[PDB]
């Protein structure tokens, strides 16, 4: 359908807009519990509603945020003051997105390598989510690097690629732009060069599968890890190194019909997440927009500021805006540091 | 686990027992509605319970039937007289089995080629079904032959193989013997030789995938189509031909660690279904047991006899027994015709 | 080896230089026989030497031609006047290249689909050719489109990709930049959209294989067909269409680490070959250089001018220069027509 | 061609005849040099001719040897007394076979993992070899187990399978039964269970590729390693273990349309090679004939007896006969030890 293809491509380009990127706010109940913990907030619906409203009602946010990934609860939620979360996003011109996977399950007879579940009923969910205001979807797969254990195994990589390709095609049949997230975890003490090799291998398998399932790259986005040393390493790789190996790994594997690569921050500090993106965009221009789809790296300071205390709201929204601005500028290679 | 492997292999061999095979009684509500229609029975739970009890309470059935595939409702059902369906099977020494797929969905951007859905929550369902008395599972995939349209497409075959391998591994992790059913439909007017070529191609892909997912063949069973002309053909292929091409297609693709091949009857008459199996077992002995997993081909006369009329019960159970005996004898290559 | 990688990447970029492209002059004895026929020249070594010298001694040719693909004879040949062919190329700053495949052979049990032969002794040949002055290599694979016959078959595509990946890796181990040529023939009456679909499928398989064999894309080049209607079609597709579908097919499949895509002209007129390239480069800038590797489309007029008559030499070299200029300008999207 | 298929299947069954197996006498000049060394014989043609004649003229050899694999020299050789080597084989009713690979080459950018070369000109060679009296061919691929280095790598396995499938199809198009030899070397100190896992993985890939290339299994033979501990292990696995894991690895992967599995002895003593085969055939009957294709394990004592001394001829031929008888009896599970 030319009409569906056009819509998907237009929406994908709008999400990958220059100077903008994604707020990943799609923490499940159990994932958000953890965050609310760090600042000693109790995880009532009302609080989740307060926090999500705090994010999405931030004045001017849409200058830097093109799209927000929601958890299903939030998609159908109202702010404490009674406005639908989707209408907050719409007032800032931020496109609502929806996490659609059902999370992870061990692959039988692997060393705790994970499949991503969620295809059953996906098509029907996508239809409902579109009617609810979503225009893009997210599905996260996870791989581990462990050279001693041959991780990621063939089965790991082939499963991740199968699920991502099926999900992406199903999204596109339902007018949702799929974000394809094959996250290679930082777990371990491998060097950046090992991450690079594994990332290239995984992305080659993912894009071959996307092609096999007839996914329209013009109407899709990628959300990969940056290429870094493992998290058991004592010093992080330099920003220059991370940018070098990350851009190279992408240029080696990703066809340029894909309109955007929206990195996950994967445990990086807020500042590193901005600086590492900025370094890639000094190296511009590129075949595709290199931008951000950040959760913690946009939210961590905002949360630690808000503190569960309502009174801390304005301060926390200002802090969210500082980080959104930083990453918008980093998209353009114009972030000066903070 | 040696213990789990042992159990699976023992159970698979028990299902593929000489002189016996499977009653496929796993019709969904909507599938059973159709059958109850032909004889003008209304599809109440009570009737479904009456009919399933009529099958499973048939005295001596376990002489010829090693295993019965149930629909979930039936697994947790009681006969009209109040005995659990599973306890009827247990009294005849018939192993309960459970259909675990969630049925079919179109693959995006194919010409109505089908994925089989059901992996989400499968592992947990298998655990519950095992506790309920199931010891084997069934998952049906479907492929079409259409040479003009390049059916079955690569995407069709690769999806069918992926789902069957994932399902089989998940079953085995939960102590259930998986029946792997990749049914190539008879739709169309292709010759038996075309069916043979496609069957061999599909089975080669299925068994490579089973190997890739670490499925234990000793603890699995296959439920393939026989190799026949398409159903738009004027005369069926001869029993000798069907047996020739079917056994050859299997010998060309199936490793002999697999303990049984339990054919689906796929629209064949009750008599053809018996004769075609019998012809294969004159050609014995074989590397694996060639037997039956029949639904209509065991049930059609039984249903048309029972008529929804209770009074017709004994006659219908006698008729079921005639067909069970016929197919048990056919497993041994000793069926004389009926 | 950083050193070998650096050399390959530098040389690939030099071949894919802006405003320049490749003269494909690697006609075998039997292929060149045909050309010499059209103008009634007899195929003596001396004539082949005269014609190749006529091409390579063309004054100023290196303004538009970065590289020349030779046949083995020519690589070790002297011009009639006694100068080595390689030294003619070196005086114009044109990089010598070498065809290294051994041509085509039918794949058993296909409908005359072709494997490309040549891996045996390739590594050793590459070493010798490098010592002889070659810095890049060429290997041609061929695929056919026939939807009724399911061409190109899986076996066709997988063989083409295997041979190209093996060859490319072997070249790179020997310091030669591989030109990867998977030519999809124009044979048949399929529409441009069918060519596009098949081209994308083939390129996806080729680049996955290149990744699997550890080929360095930064040190390689692609020589694909343009995307066109089949040659049994009455009107050629418009330049705009050909450019649209060709650039899209590339953007959909080719990672942008590849430095150049040097099209084959595949039976196009000299003028179409220039105009179609020029149209793609109005659509610039691109993720990779889109340029030319033309044989007939650079040579046809030159040959028909020279006529086997020596006296026609200057005229024929002027004619070669007109076409080289045209295609150099087309690389830049600045060709005005001829 | 029914006619070619019939011939191949008949010949494959004749090679895999009960109570018989293959003498692998296809040592290249450089391989035979080594053997002639151990007993201080100088490697003249005349000696190679003497030794090969000593083997092939052994009276009654054809009771136990169905087929002899030759090196090309030997296929076109005469015995010292002037009889063609092929005519010696024909007088004993032994089918001549021919090694057709061109040996091994490193795969670029692997840790010295090997491709097998030889496809170029294979078809034409097969035609000539058939005219010369060959009716079966051999092609050896090699893989290593090194879990620390992820050997055998995907590239290793996929290359081995590609070459074996291409070669097998080409042989069959030329009326030669292909012996498919994917030898997993014993190098290293891995346990028998690791060998088993790797063997199963490799055979699954090989047989999927054979299917993809349209190889007729009924007209082919396999020559795999037995499943054993690595050669750096202090005690060999027991005969019972080796037989258990070897038969299981085959039953798990090899379709039973294949008529024979003719093991390589891979560094085993003459006695172990016989006992290990005999142990497998106590476990009979099997889906395919389990037999032998032995070089050293048939020849070692014969060579050490002959000593380069002509006078030792009769003794050496008697010794060859003892080992041929032993392995013929082992095929039948009736060898009592020596």
DSSP summary character for residue C212 = H
Whole-number Cα distances in Å, D39 to D34, D44, D302, D307, D323: 9, 14, 11, 5, 19
- Residue B305's domain spans which residues? 1-338
DSSP summary character for residue D39 = T
Q: Which of residues 276-335 of D touch C (CB under 8 A)?
A: none
Cα–Cα distance between C131 and C126 in angstroms, integer?
Answer: 9
Closest-CA distance of chain C to residue A297, Å: 29
Question: Count of CB atoms within 10 A of residue B131's CB?
Answer: 8
> Among B327, B325, B322, which Cα is nearest to B265's?
B327
Nearest CA in chain A to C204: A208
D184 contacts C133 by C-beta, under 8 angstroms: no
Cα–Cα distance between A115 and B121 in angstroms, integer?
Answer: 12
Question: CATH no. for residue A91?
Answer: 3.20.20.70
Residue in B118, B154, B170 closest to A108 by CB: B170
| D147 contacts on A by Cβ (under 8 Å) | 150
Residue from A252, A288, A290 to probe the interface with C (highest C Cβ count within 10 Å): A252
Helices (H), A66-153: 72-75, 85-91, 122-131
Nearest CA in chain A to D151: A150
Closest-CA distance of chain D to residue B205, Å: 7
> Among D171, D195, D309, D319, which Cα is nearest to D245's?
D195
Q: Which of residues 30-49 of A touch B (CB under 8 A)?
A: none
> Among B215, B152, B136, B218, which Cα is nearest to B187's?
B152
DSSP summary character for residue B233 = S
Sign for the CA dihedral angle at C337, C246, C202, A161 comes to positive
Q: Which residues are CB-contacts of B282 (< 8 A; sequence separation ≥ 6)?
A: B243, B333
Of the candidates B113, B159, B181, B329, the residue annotated as catalytic is B181
Question: Count of CB atoms within 10 A of residue C76's CB?
Answer: 15
A99 contacts A74 by C-beta, under 8 angstroms: no
Please indicate if any CB of chain A lies within 8 Å of the CB of C253. yes
Of the candidates C99, C151, C223, C313, the residue annotated as catalytic is C223
Of the candidates D159, D181, D279, D329, the residue annotated as catalytic is D181
Query: Cα D42 from chain centroid?
Result: 26
3-class state of residue B137 by DSSP: strand
Cβ distance of A150 and D154 shorter than 8 Å? no
Number of H helices, E strands in chain A: 12, 10
C31 contacts C299 by C-beta, under 8 angstroms: no
3-class state of residue B203 by DSSP: helix
> Among C162, C158, C116, which Cα is nearest to C138's?
C116
Whole-number Cα distances in Å, D252 to A289, B214, B220, B242, D13: 49, 11, 12, 26, 22
Cα–Cα distance between D293 and D273 in angstroms, integer?
Answer: 10
Cβ distance of B173 and A107 shorter than 8 Å? no
Sign for the CA dihedral angle at C104, C106, C112, C116 comes to negative
| D119 contacts on C by Cβ (under 8 Å) | 115, 117, 119-120
Residue B181 appears among annotated catalytic residues: yes
Residue in D201, D212, D251 closest to B255 by CB: D251
Element housing A304 (H / E): helix A296-306
Of the candidates B20, B138, B151, B223, the residue annotated as catalytic is B223
- Extended beta strands in C65-135, E state: 65-70, 95-99, 104-106, 114-116
Q: Which neighbouring-strand residues pair with C182?
A: C141
Q: Alpha-carbon Rg of chain D, whole angstroms?
A: 19
Cβ distance of B254 and D252 shorter than 8 Å? no
Residue in C147, C148, C154 closest to B154 by CB: C154
Query: Cα D299 from chain centroid?
Result: 13
Closest-CA distance of chain B to residue D251, Å: 5
Q: Which residues are CB-contacts of C215 (< 8 A; sequence separation ≥ 6)?
A: C165, C168, C169, C172, C178
Residue in D201, D251, D255 closest to B251 by CB: D255
Cα–Cα distance between C33 and D226 in angstroms, integer?
Answer: 55
> What's the half-sphere exposure (Cβ side, CA atoms, 13 Å) at A163?
29
Residue in C207, C248, C287 closest to A287 by CB: C287
Helices (H), chain C: 2-15, 29-38, 45-56, 72-75, 85-91, 122-131, 154-173, 192-212, 239-253, 270-282, 296-306, 313-331
Element housing A181 (H / E): strand A177-184
Cβ distance of A120 and B123 shorter than 8 Å? no
Cβ distance of B211 and D200 shorter than 8 Å? yes
Cα–Cα distance between C312 and C298 in angstroms, integer?
Answer: 17
DSSP string spanning D79-143?
-TTS-BHHHHHHHTTPEEEEE----EEEPTTSSS-EEEP--TTHHHHHHHHHHTT--EEEEEEEE
> What's the half-sphere exposure (Cβ side, CA atoms, 13 Å) at B173?
18
Neighbours of chain A (3+ CB pairs under 8 A): B, C, D
Q: Which neighbouring-strand residues pair with A291?
A: A262
Cβ distance of A169 and B109 shorter than 8 Å? yes
Cα–Cα distance between B87 and B24 in angstroms, integer?
Answer: 17
Residue in A147, A148, A154 closest to D154 by CB: A154
Element housing B130 (H / E): helix B122-131
Into how many domains does chain B fold?
Answer: 1
Cα–Cα distance between D176 and D135 in angstroms, integer?
Answer: 5
Cα–Cα distance between C325 and C292 in angstroms, integer?
Answer: 12
The crossing angle, in degrees rounded to 10, of helices D239-253 and D270-282 is 60
Query: Cα A66 from chain centroid?
Result: 13
Q: Which of residues 144-203 of C touch D (CB under 8 A)?
A: 154-155, 158-159, 162, 166, 169-170, 172-173
Resolution in A: 1.8
Nearest CA in chain D to C116: D120
Q: How was this structure determined?
A: X-ray
């Amino acid at each position: 359908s030319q009409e569906v293809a056009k819509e998907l491509a237009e929406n994908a380009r709008k999400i990958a807009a220059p100077g903008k990127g994604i707020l990943a706010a799609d923490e499940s109940t159990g994932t958000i519990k953890k965050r609310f913990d760090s600042i000693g907030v109790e995880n009532t619906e009302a609080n989740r509603a307060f926090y999500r409203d705090l994010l999405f009602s931030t004045k001017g946010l849409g200058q830097y945020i093109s799209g927000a990934i929601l958890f299903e609860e939030t998609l159908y939620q109202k702010s404490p003051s009674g406005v639908p979360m989707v209408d907050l996003l719409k007032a800032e011109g931020i496109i609502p997105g929806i996490k659609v996977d059902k999370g992870l399950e061990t692959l039988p007879l692997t060393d705790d390598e994970k499949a991503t579940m969620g295809l059953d009923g996906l098509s029907e969910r996508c239809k409902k989510y579109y009617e609810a205001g979503a225009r893009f979807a997210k599905w996260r797969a996870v791989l581990s690097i462990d050279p001693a254990k041959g991780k990621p195994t063939n089965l790991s990589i082939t499963e991740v690629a199968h699920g991502l390709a099926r999900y992406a095609a199903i999204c596109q049949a339902n007018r949702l732009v799929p974000i394809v997230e094959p996250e290679i975890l930082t777990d371990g003490s491998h060097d950046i060069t090992v991450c690079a090799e594994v990332t290239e291998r995984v992305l080659a398998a993912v894009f071959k599968a996307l092609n096999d399932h007839h996914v329209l790259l013009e109407g899709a986005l990628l959300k990969p890890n940056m290429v870094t040393h493992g998290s058991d390493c004592p010093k992080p790789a330099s920003h220059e190194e991370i940018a070098f190996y990350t851009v190279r790994s992408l240029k080696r594997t990703v066809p340029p019909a894909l309109p955007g690569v929206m990195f996950l921050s994967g445990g990086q500090s807020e500042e590193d997440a901005s600086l590492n993106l900025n370094e890639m965009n000094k190296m511009g221009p590129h075949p595709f927009q290199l931008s951000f789809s950040y959760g913690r790296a946009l939210q961590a300071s905002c949360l630690k500021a808000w503190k569960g205390v309502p009174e801390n709201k304005a301060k926390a929204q200002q802090v969210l805006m500082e980080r959104a601005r930083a990453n918008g500028e980093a998209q353009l290679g114009k972030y000066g540091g903070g």
